[PDB]
């Protein structure tokens, strides 16, 4: 998903890329640096925002999102969720799930 | 002289949408508000088709301790018209509720009803303490522990 013109939770809610990118994307496997036996959950991700990102916009807000019709007022509950879930990076994870 | 410089238009500010009356009410009340739910081995599949499906009633009712959707977000389900929907109605213990999801194991996930790793759909349950329990114990719901 780290490429222009693509859609999804990261291309929309974490890193929007403009369709006119000039530059290079580089990525490598990081199993033996990032993953721990008990799982490293120090890297957090977003699943729900109010709208899609504009390119290179970096939103670090931790406001509890409203999934229902009632306001959350910074407090979780029914149809109220924190924005960031943790990732279960483990050294035994499959190709899909390793960092 | 005379010179054509620009072009005149009127940009609109408001948009209107008109659709015909919502008619074909999908069977949902007969599933979620049903008086009786079958056992965990005579599981109730009911096929829902040829009806308009309102999901905000369920997802914004706040009577479901589990709303877990795989392959689809629960808020855009109103903006989709599927070929068919299979409504699976039962009753199950709370500690076993975590077993109704793809990729899981357990006596229910292995010996009652297997969900494939590639599910597209939603699991939703609500506490039936005041509906399915009796003082002397309701043993009309049967559970298997052994299979070949």
């Amino acid at each position: 998903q780290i490429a222009p013109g693509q859609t999804g939770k990261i291309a929309d809610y974490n890193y929007k890329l403009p369709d006119d990118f000039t530059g290079c994307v580089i990525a490598w496997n990081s199993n033996n640096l990032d993953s721990k036996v008990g799982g490293n959950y120090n890297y957090l991700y977003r699943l729900f925002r109010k709208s899609n990102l504009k390119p290179f916009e970096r939103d670090i807000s931790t406001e509890i999102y409203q999934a229902g019709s009632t306001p959350c007022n910074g407090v979780e509950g029914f149809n109220c969720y924190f924005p960031l879930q943790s990732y279960g990076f483990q050294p035994t994870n499959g190709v899909g799930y390793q960092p | 002289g005379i010179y054509q410089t620009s072009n005149f238009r009127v940009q609109p500010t408001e948009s209107i949408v008109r659709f015909p009356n919502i008619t074909n009410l999908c069977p949902f009340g007969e599933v979620f508000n049903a008086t009786r739910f079958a056992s965990v081995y005579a599981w109730n599949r009911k096929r829902i088709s040829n009806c308009v499906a309102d999901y905000s009633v369920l997802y914004n009712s706040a009577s479901f301790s589990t709303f877990k959707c795989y392959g689809v977000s629960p808020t855009k389900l109103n903006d989709l018209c599927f070929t068919n929907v299979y409504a699976d109605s039962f009753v199950i213990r709370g500690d076993e509720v975590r077993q109704i999801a793809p990729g899981q194991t357990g006596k229910i996930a292995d010996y009652n009803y297997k969900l494939p790793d590639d599910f597209t759909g939603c699991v939703i349950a609500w506490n039936s303490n005041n509906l399915d329990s009796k003082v002397g114990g309701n043993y009309n719901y049967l559970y298997r522990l052994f299979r070949k």
């Binding site: 222009p4 013109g5 859609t7 369709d19 | -």
Partner: protein, 50 residues
């Protein structure tokens, strides 16, 4: 007069052609596709109409 009428009529009918695009309706293609593909389809329509 006839020629001029034809000259306009054909022109307007050229709005109904795809010219290789999925739809001859720019609004339909946009209401369907995100910018990075709607742009290719709109480019095809632009070429045909121009």
């Amino acid at each position: 007069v006839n020629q001029n009428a034809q000259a306009l009529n054909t022109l307007v009918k050229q709005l109904s052609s795809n010219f290789g695009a999925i739809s001859s309706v720019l609004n339909d293609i946009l209401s369907r596709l995100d910018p990075p593909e709607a742009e290719v389809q709109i480019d095809r329509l632009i070429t045909g109409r121009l």
